[PDB]
């Protein structure tokens, strides 16, 4: 189709203005004080929320060249989302504030290479400032602190958080999932479970809890359908001559099979349960090998010319406890060699990172905390789903602040370490005049986090900042309370990976979004 | 670009009806070789009506070929509100016409009219294997998937109503990725929501899609409002010929619009469509373009053809007037030769009711025997 | 599709010209002195309704951001209508209110997040107040009380839920379904019933009701196919000696079964009557083990491993009278074991609990009554059909209200017990000056139905309001009659659960959609 | 469809008109110093012609007379590519010379049936007349 091209300024000021239009939608969300945003959706009701990238990820404007402004501004939340899970609306102030003084020196009479050239020397030292600066977050304060911190100032969600993390270890995995009461609860798993269920309601040896308990029983690890019993004669009558019991896990088993089985069951000769394997397609054979290496047992695959006549005692596992009930099976203490935990857990771990989906990634870390560890679920209560939504995304938000703060560490809160960063790196020069420029640029936007976060108060900006200014190490302001002291102390921590993050992918987009000098769109 | 297709499967009752619709001629042309059939159907709650204007010798009772075709899909419940055998089917098909002996006179057959005027398309692309644009051909695969796990009964709590959506994307005219998978369909009520997208997507998304095509930017949606248990011809009215573009091509190809189930090939609404894709199929198949459509236009009463005409959107490695020259020389675009050469005269209008009338190897309109001698004569 | 953004007070205003408009339609239905309002249908004739969330499901505005509005409020109605039943334009006149002081506060510039969470508190607080003054309600006559106040002041369907629910007992399945006469029936079920008829019309003998009626007979309970008459000599046989009538339950018995079971009866060898198994699934199964628990036997199922040959008369149920029509089989007074019932009652019960969906939960209750209690239906009788769907609505509404009172408690009813609340709280307190606005906030917002059912009845809610907030304990106003009096007295009840629920849910909504500061919508 | 008839002056001035701006469009090359023509098409690049009948192949004028005009005299052009290969420009130069000279005689108050006879005769001859001058290559 026809296309419209604009050159130089003209361009440059559409694109700065798609730029303030989305950036002042975002902004609105920043801070302990700041506001919700309504987004309206066709398939329902309104979804209000407070997240920078919900926001961002719905905001494109009428004129072309405002959208791409808008578009290319986009990335940056979306990038900062994906990478950290926190830190979006200050990515996205970051680079509005580094787009606005770049754009005003390219507007001075300067060339853009240089001051992106600067831009990034300056990031790259700020970098390795912030590095310097962090400190290890270890105790489960800290956590406490940097979670109620991540969830707009809420002490429950943060305390709650730590006690399931301190609970399931480092190696699990915990999630959140809409609850049905009025207040949060917290659920954890011990061992491993999988939602697999009885076959036959016959097998059940304790109705007062509508469940089956095997004491040292044997598992069977099989593969194939079953609808003929003549396959498992020795097996049964091996394990009929020692009297404790047995576990039948197969893909499906028919009623012929189970005729035999709840009569034998039934007549007291033989005490059997049967439950189906869990899962399916490839992902079911990888969690039967699981149980067979944790059960110290051997799997029984017809594919590889392993036949269930020929199976004997070897090839079954043991376990001190097993518990099924009509929706779960679960097996307590496994007697499986510790060697192969370790190199199965190794394989999983190494074969997460060639998986590209964070599905997959998801479904591999859980079948890592299944085998080795706990698996903890947070049922968020709310009275409305509009209010469940908005919890829900807060306790993730949470989540996903205490998990970076555990990975690499926690710095001052309230945006006081970039100032600490820009102040201790005031020194830095480059090859020419327009790179430090560009470094000058860089240093003074690094201040834009605290001054928004001040006008969100009502406060005057300028004054705060220059009060933080002048303090040392982690003094710096406290919105909530409108009063100075040490960010430390009164528990406004935040993680270095968040900052780290945010202020590269600002900095990445925008220095290349300085450089533009005409566009090329469709005609309206 | 982005652009989608949507596929439906074979519980939806329009497909219901056209499946129906097309049972029955296969039934009459089994038993009359040279009858004259025009029918539709039309399905509700519990209430099942057929109409149309069928001419033939022979006799065939409808309830037993509408009991048979019906239990064929699965409603053999009534869970959905529609059961084969406790449902009742009314006739109301002309069995009789008046010209049966007035016009018995023929002169010659290879030199019949066509019965209706209008211009009709074909259309062929290489970017599938199938020679058939991408999108509506993968939204058939999937449902065609869901059926056959259905069928094979390792998902027995699947249910026939079933809706596919996919999306692709386009970077220099050629496919690049896959950008959305929506699988909408019903299932019973036993299972949980969570379980339910775990099986679908592992499954049916998982083995049908290609691997190397899929990218971490691909989004999957399953049961967007999440709950479709309702289903069945209790939720929507039923009747025949209403989404030809869903069958045909999806939208990628211009259409005529013509309705295909119900008809008999002596119409040329229906076989001329045919021999157009077949034609169509045939020059691409060679290398001589990387898409062509074939533009055939009857006129009714008229016995020759009125204009033949092709376009190439300019990928043709030889000019278009040599491209214009080898279809009328060596494919017999006459109503009834086309008829004769693609020997339609069989009882194979079943399996085309469902799942597309085109994309499919074993149909006689889709051979490729003929491309090699076009590229010999071209060279 | 492009987006139009609204920052601050334009959304602000704009979002409550919305909640103004649903609320302004749906309030004019509270109270005795109510009207009704039209809606109409595209296909067929419009209803006329007097539900607040029949109201709210219909209102829809062409601006964008009123729309907004519109559907965030109608959530209130929607939830109040899904948990209780009843008590939905109370609760959209409290999230109005809630909301209009709200949006005031806001603007005269506190802090929305402070406002919210005084909010949140005083309805904490409000919640266990009630709890505090709520009193039993065991009594026939508060129940009729209820009734007749939940239905627009009509007698004749409080009187006939109250004898209904007495007749039924405490446990059992009340359900309204449309009449043919010009005046309410109730017709109640005495023993078990399951909706499945006789399979051949050759078995009847009675003619005069069209009806077979087997005195004393024998029931054989067969979960497989009936196909060959093979299996069938031994038990009829056992059965011919007795002289014994008997009856068969099966999931489906083939035509050529059928024939020689009508050829003996006709002859007058045995008097055997068959009838399909109800349900499908598990549930067929688990409720045709609750029939042979009923009955005393035991079912013979090919999945256990018990043959049909091998039955003996010890396999076979009994009971007083069977009696099967075209549609529906019932069994009157099965001789089985009480102390057997009662476990497999408590056994369904406890399932119960574990029930996660309402769906789920109803047939439990109802096969619950089926083994325990009875069912009873309640048919409306009216003129023409709208009045019939109107009249229909109001029996549902009193239905849920007299349920909800017996199993939480009633309060004194025509807003009073708020005012009570709200009165007892004067001195809540929270943290800051914004907390304490919201809590006030929140109680002054508290008045509002009180307020709206006298300026329905036509009078200065002001001097009504002062009135009753000057006296103590349930001291009202009864809008009837336009008189001052005991609440309780003069039978004006309201459960505790209803007025619970509004409120939390009413305060759940309007606090968030106080804080909301832009919104943003597609272009018109 | 409805039709639109034109009688006599009317008609020829239009077709002169369509007769005209074919020749003026494909007359431009000509000779050792004709220059070239653009032609436009919808699917790739614009080609750059200097033949005859390719520039004649693509004029298709908005008014329906002059359409009938151009198509009338795209024939010289398509039977001179087909017969020899060369020689369309000349053609239809010739042809719009004699179309032009024709109809100035018949405005003059000549029978355009002799008009055609006195030229085919004269064609004739000419033809014959060439056959004498041609040289052994
Ligand atoms: N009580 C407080 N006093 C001062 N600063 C705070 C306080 N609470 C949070 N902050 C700062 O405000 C920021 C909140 O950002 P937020 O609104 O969560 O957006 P995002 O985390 O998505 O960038 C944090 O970086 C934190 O440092
Ligand atoms: N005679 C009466 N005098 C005073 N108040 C009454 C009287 N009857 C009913 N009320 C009050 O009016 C309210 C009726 O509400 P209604 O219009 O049924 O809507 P909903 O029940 O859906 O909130 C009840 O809460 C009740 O307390
Ligand atoms: F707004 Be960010 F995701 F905390
Ligand atoms: F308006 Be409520 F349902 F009484
Ligand atoms: F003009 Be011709 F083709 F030389
Ligand atoms: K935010
Ligand atoms: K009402
Ligand atoms: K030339
Ligand atoms: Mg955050
Ligand atoms: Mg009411």
Same mark, same amino acid.
């Given at each position: 189709a026809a296309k419209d091209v604009k050159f130089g300024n003209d361009a440059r000021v559409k694109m700065l203005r798609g730029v303030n239009v989305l950036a002042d939608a975002v902004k609105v969300?920043?801070? #302990?004080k700041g506001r919700n945003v309504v987004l309206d959706k066709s398939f329902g009701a309104p979804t209000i929320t407070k997240d920078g990238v919900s926001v961002a990820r719905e905001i494109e404007l009428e004129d072309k060249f405002e959208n791409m402004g808008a578009q290319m501004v986009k990335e940056v939340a979306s990038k900062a989302n994906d990478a950290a899970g926190d830190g979006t609306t200050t990515a996205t102030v970051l680079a509005q504030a580094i787009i606005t003084e770049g754009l005003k020196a390219v507007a001075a009479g300067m060339n853009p290479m240089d001051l992106k050239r600067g831009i990034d020397k300056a990031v790259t030292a700020a970098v390795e400032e912030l590095k310097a600066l962090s400190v290890p977050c270890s105790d489960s304060k800290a956590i406490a602190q940097v979670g109620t911190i991540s969830a707009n100032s809420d002490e429950t969600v943060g305390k709650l958080i730590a006690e399931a993390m301190d609970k399931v270890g480092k190696e699990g995995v915990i999630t959140v999932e809409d609850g049905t009461g009025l207040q949060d609860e917290l659920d954890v798993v011990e061992g491993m479970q999988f939602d697999r269920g009885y076959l036959?309601?016959?097998?059940?040896? =304790?109705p007062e809890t509508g469940a089956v308990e095997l004491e040292s029983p044997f598992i069977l690890l099989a593969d194939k359908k079953i609808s003929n019993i003549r396959e498992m004669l020795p097996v049964l009558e091996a394990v009929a001559k020692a009297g404790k019991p047995l576990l039948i896990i197969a893909e499906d088993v028919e009623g012929e099979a189970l005729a035999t089985l709840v009569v034998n069951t039934m007549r007291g000769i033989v005490k059997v349960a049967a439950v189906k394997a869990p899962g399916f397609g490839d992902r079911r054979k990888a969690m039967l090998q699981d149980i067979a290496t944790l059960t110290g047992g051997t799997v029984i695959s017809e594919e590889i010319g392993?036949?269930?006549? =020929?199976?004997?005692?070897?090839?079954l596992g043991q376990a001190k406890r097993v518990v099924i009930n009509k929706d779960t099976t679960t097996i307590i203490?496994?007697?499986?060699?510790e060697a192969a935990i370790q190199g199965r857990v190794a394989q999983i771990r190494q074969q997460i990172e060639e998986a590209t989906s964070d599905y997959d990634r998801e479904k591999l870390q859980e079948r890592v905390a299944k085998l080795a560890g706990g698996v903890a679920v947070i049922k968020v209560g709310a009275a409305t789903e509009v209010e469940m939504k908005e919890k829900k995304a807060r306790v993730e938000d949470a989540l996903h602040a205490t998990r970076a703060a555990v990975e690499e560490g926690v710095v001052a809160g309230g945006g006081v370490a970039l100032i600490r960063v820009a102040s201790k790196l005031a020194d830095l020069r480059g090859q020419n005049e327009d790179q430090n420029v560009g470094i000058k640029v860089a240093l003074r936007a690094m201040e834009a986090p605290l001054r928004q976060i001040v006008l969100n108060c009502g406060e005057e900006p300028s004054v705060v900042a220059n009060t933080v200014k002048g303090?040392?190490?982690?003094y710096g302001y406290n919105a909530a309370t409108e009063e100075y002291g040490n960010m430390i102390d009164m528990g406004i921590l935040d993680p270095t990976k968040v900052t780290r993050s945010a202020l590269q992918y600002a900095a990445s987009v925008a220095g290349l979004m300085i450089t533009t000098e005409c566009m090329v769109t469709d005609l309206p | 670009h982005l652009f989608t297709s949507e596929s439906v499967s074979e519980g939806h009752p329009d497909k219901i009806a056209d499946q129906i619709s097309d049972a029955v001629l296969d039934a009459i042309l089994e038993q009359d070789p040279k009858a004259r059939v025009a029918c539709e159907t039309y399905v509700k709650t519990g209430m099942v009506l057929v109409g149309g204007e069928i001419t033939t010798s022979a006799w065939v009772d409808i309830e037993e070929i509408t009991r048979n075709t019906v239990r064929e899909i699965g409603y053999v419940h009534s869970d959905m509100g529609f059961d084969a055998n406790s449902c009742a089917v009314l006739s109301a098909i002309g069995?009789?016409?008046?010209?049966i002996n007035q016009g018995?006179?023929? /002169?010659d057959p290879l030199e019949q009219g066509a019965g209706d005027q209008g211009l009709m398309f074909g259309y062929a692309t290489n970017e599938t294997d199938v020679l058939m644009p991408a999108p509506i051909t993968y939204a058939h695969r999937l449902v065609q998937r869901q059926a056959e796990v259905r069928k094979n009964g390792?998902?027995?709590?699947?249910?026939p109503d079933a809706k596919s959506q996919v999306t692709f994307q386009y970077d220099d005219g050629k496919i690049v990725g896959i950008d959305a998978v929506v699988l909408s369909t019903q299932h019973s009520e036993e299972i949980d929501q969570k379980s339910l997208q775990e099986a679908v997507m592992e499954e049916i998304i998982k083995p049908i899609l290609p691997a190397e095509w899929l990218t971490s930017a691909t989004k999957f949606f399953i049961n967007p409002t999440g709950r479709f248990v309702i289903g069945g011809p209790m939720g929507d009215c039923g009747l025949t010929g209403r989404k030809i573009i869903v069958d045909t091509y999806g939208g990628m190809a211009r259409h005529g619009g013509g309705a295909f189930?119900?008809?008999?090939?002596? =119409?040329?609404?229906?076989s001329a469509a045919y021999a157009a894709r077949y034609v169509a199929k045939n020059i691409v198949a060679a290398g001589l373009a990387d898409r062509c459509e074939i533009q055939v236009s009857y006129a009714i009463g008229? /016995?020759?053809?009125t204009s033949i005409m092709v376009e190439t959107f300019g990928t043709e490695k030889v000019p278009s007037e040599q491209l214009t020259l080898l279809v009328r020389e060596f494919?017999?675009?006459? #109503?009834y030769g086309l008829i004769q050469m693609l020997?339609?005269?069989? #009882?194979?209008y079943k399996e085309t /009711? /469902?799942?597309?009338?085109?994309?499919?190897?074993?149909? #006689?309109?889709? =051979?490729?025997?003929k491309a090699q001698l076009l590229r010999d004569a071209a060279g």
């Amino acid at each position: 189709a026809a296309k419209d091209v604009k050159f130089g300024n003209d361009a440059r000021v559409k694109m700065l203005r798609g730029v303030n239009v989305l950036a002042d939608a975002v902004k609105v969300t920043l801070g #302990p004080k700041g506001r919700n945003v309504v987004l309206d959706k066709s398939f329902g009701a309104p979804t209000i929320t407070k997240d920078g990238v919900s926001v961002a990820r719905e905001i494109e404007l009428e004129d072309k060249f405002e959208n791409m402004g808008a578009q290319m501004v986009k990335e940056v939340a979306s990038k900062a989302n994906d990478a950290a899970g926190d830190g979006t609306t200050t990515a996205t102030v970051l680079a509005q504030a580094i787009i606005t003084e770049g754009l005003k020196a390219v507007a001075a009479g300067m060339n853009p290479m240089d001051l992106k050239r600067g831009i990034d020397k300056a990031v790259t030292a700020a970098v390795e400032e912030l590095k310097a600066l962090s400190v290890p977050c270890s105790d489960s304060k800290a956590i406490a602190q940097v979670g109620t911190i991540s969830a707009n100032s809420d002490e429950t969600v943060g305390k709650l958080i730590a006690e399931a993390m301190d609970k399931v270890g480092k190696e699990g995995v915990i999630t959140v999932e809409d609850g049905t009461g009025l207040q949060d609860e917290l659920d954890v798993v011990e061992g491993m479970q999988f939602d697999r269920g009885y076959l036959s309601p016959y097998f059940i040896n =304790k109705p007062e809890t509508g469940a089956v308990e095997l004491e040292s029983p044997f598992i069977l690890l099989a593969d194939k359908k079953i609808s003929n019993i003549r396959e498992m004669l020795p097996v049964l009558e091996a394990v009929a001559k020692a009297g404790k019991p047995l576990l039948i896990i197969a893909e499906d088993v028919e009623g012929e099979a189970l005729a035999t089985l709840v009569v034998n069951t039934m007549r007291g000769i033989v005490k059997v349960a049967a439950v189906k394997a869990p899962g399916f397609g490839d992902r079911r054979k990888a969690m039967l090998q699981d149980i067979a290496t944790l059960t110290g047992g051997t799997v029984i695959s017809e594919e590889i010319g392993m036949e269930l006549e =020929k199976a004997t005692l070897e090839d079954l596992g043991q376990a001190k406890r097993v518990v099924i009930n009509k929706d779960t099976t679960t097996i307590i203490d496994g007697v499986g060699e510790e060697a192969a935990i370790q190199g199965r857990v190794a394989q999983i771990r190494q074969q997460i990172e060639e998986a590209t989906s964070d599905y997959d990634r998801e479904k591999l870390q859980e079948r890592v905390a299944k085998l080795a560890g706990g698996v903890a679920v947070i049922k968020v209560g709310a009275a409305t789903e509009v209010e469940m939504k908005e919890k829900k995304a807060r306790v993730e938000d949470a989540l996903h602040a205490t998990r970076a703060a555990v990975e690499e560490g926690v710095v001052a809160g309230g945006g006081v370490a970039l100032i600490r960063v820009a102040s201790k790196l005031a020194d830095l020069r480059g090859q020419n005049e327009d790179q430090n420029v560009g470094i000058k640029v860089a240093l003074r936007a690094m201040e834009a986090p605290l001054r928004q976060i001040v006008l969100n108060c009502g406060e005057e900006p300028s004054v705060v900042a220059n009060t933080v200014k002048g303090g040392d190490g982690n003094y710096g302001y406290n919105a909530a309370t409108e009063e100075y002291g040490n960010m430390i102390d009164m528990g406004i921590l935040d993680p270095t990976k968040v900052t780290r993050s945010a202020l590269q992918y600002a900095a990445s987009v925008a220095g290349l979004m300085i450089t533009t000098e005409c566009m090329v769109t469709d005609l309206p | 670009h982005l652009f989608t297709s949507e596929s439906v499967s074979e519980g939806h009752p329009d497909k219901i009806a056209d499946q129906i619709s097309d049972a029955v001629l296969d039934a009459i042309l089994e038993q009359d070789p040279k009858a004259r059939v025009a029918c539709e159907t039309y399905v509700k709650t519990g209430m099942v009506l057929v109409g149309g204007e069928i001419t033939t010798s022979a006799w065939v009772d409808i309830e037993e070929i509408t009991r048979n075709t019906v239990r064929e899909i699965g409603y053999v419940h009534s869970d959905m509100g529609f059961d084969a055998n406790s449902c009742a089917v009314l006739s109301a098909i002309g069995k009789q016409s008046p010209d049966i002996n007035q016009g018995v006179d023929r /002169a010659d057959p290879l030199e019949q009219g066509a019965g209706d005027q209008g211009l009709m398309f074909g259309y062929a692309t290489n970017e599938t294997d199938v020679l058939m644009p991408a999108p509506i051909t993968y939204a058939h695969r999937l449902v065609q998937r869901q059926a056959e796990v259905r069928k094979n009964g390792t998902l027995p709590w699947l249910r026939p109503d079933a809706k596919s959506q996919v999306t692709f994307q386009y970077d220099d005219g050629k496919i690049v990725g896959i950008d959305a998978v929506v699988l909408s369909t019903q299932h019973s009520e036993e299972i949980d929501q969570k379980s339910l997208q775990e099986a679908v997507m592992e499954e049916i998304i998982k083995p049908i899609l290609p691997a190397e095509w899929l990218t971490s930017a691909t989004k999957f949606f399953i049961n967007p409002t999440g709950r479709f248990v309702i289903g069945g011809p209790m939720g929507d009215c039923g009747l025949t010929g209403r989404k030809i573009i869903v069958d045909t091509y999806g939208g990628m190809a211009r259409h005529g619009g013509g309705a295909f189930s119900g008809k008999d090939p002596s =119409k040329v609404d229906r076989s001329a469509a045919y021999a157009a894709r077949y034609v169509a199929k045939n020059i691409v198949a060679a290398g001589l373009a990387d898409r062509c459509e074939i533009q055939v236009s009857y006129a009714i009463g008229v /016995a020759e053809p009125t204009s033949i005409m092709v376009e190439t959107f300019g990928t043709e490695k030889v000019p278009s007037e040599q491209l214009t020259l080898l279809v009328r020389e060596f494919f017999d675009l006459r #109503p009834y030769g086309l008829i004769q050469m693609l020997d339609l005269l069989h #009882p194979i209008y079943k399996e085309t /009711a /469902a799942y597309g009338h085109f994309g499919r190897e074993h149909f #006689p309109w889709e =051979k490729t025997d003929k491309a090699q001698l076009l590229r010999d004569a071209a060279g």
